[PDB]
Amino acid sequence: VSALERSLRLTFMDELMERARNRDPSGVSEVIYDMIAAGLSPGPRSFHGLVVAHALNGDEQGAMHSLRKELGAGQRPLPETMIALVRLSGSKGNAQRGLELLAAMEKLNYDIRQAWLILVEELVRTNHLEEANKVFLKGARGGMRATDQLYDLMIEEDCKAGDHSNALDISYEMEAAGRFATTFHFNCLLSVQATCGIP
Amino acid sequence: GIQRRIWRRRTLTKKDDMLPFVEEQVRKIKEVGKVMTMDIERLLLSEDNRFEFVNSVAAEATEYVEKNRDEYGGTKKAIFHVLSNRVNDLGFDRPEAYAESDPYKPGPGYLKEY
Amino acid sequence: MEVWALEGFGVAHILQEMLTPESFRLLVRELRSLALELNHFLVSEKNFQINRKEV
């Protein structure tokens, strides 16, 4: 890498990242074609700005298309790039796409624990509790250990919705991981058991 | 402390008073299967409850039979394979499923008589 | 006494093999002859739904 190439990449990546943060996926596409005209090869961080720009404007199809451009260019997506797509999929309730992206990160040899934690919280936040339980249990049964904050989140939200079957499954997996249930978790299960008519 | 490097080797510098015909017995112990008896007691020293140890061994033995059906039931028993694997997991060495055979058998058709 | 010895060892699956159900299904019919019904219900610990076992 010469000094002239480094100088151009700085001003090209300055313009590109100032439009990704501006939530302008169209502008981020123009700069990439400016890089191609100059002969500069867009790296993983240039397509990251394209994914983020689409992701910030709630655009799941364009962000997935941007990922295909990155893969089609032979570049390796950053771990943060996949997390932006995983978090976007959860916000739209697309658990199937969120799980497909997690499989890609495992294929890319990344660490999917943090991205799996993000996917479950997005589904819970966006009132997709049924989808969140499916994703959470698959990760928990797969061997991943969730955060204590997320364990308390999943148990409590299921019991507020009257879903004792999922809340009991999670609490069993929580102890199998090595986190013992406390009075808080039992009080969540009892909130549903007390209404079943069988004392 | 640091001297150049030359250093003082630590030695006992104090007196500790605490510092051959079993071949037939040793070979008979292996023949009767007493080695696995000591291994079972060794494994149970690492177990809090012996009833969950029995269940876990049976659960692991069931997985072996589903995975490879035809290799078990004769000279290799699944439960013996589980116990030998768990001893090897501790870092010690045991033959697979504790299976041993008589090398002095005078050919096919001959059964050793007790 | 053999059942007691097996229970003392805690060999629950050995005891189940040596007992096996026809012994209990036949008991239900004889109780039915006295105008008594003996129903076996399983309550699910997950969703609290009651299942009547086929006896």
């Binding site: 032979g74 497909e100 499989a103 890319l108 | 009833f51 | -």
Partner: peptide, 17 residues
């Protein structure tokens, strides 16, 4: 005893080269 206590992305998206 032993009865106590119940006993594909990244595919078809490669570089054309």
């Amino acid at each position: 005893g032993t009865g106590f206590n119940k006993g594909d992305i990244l595919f078809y998206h490669r570089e054309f080269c």
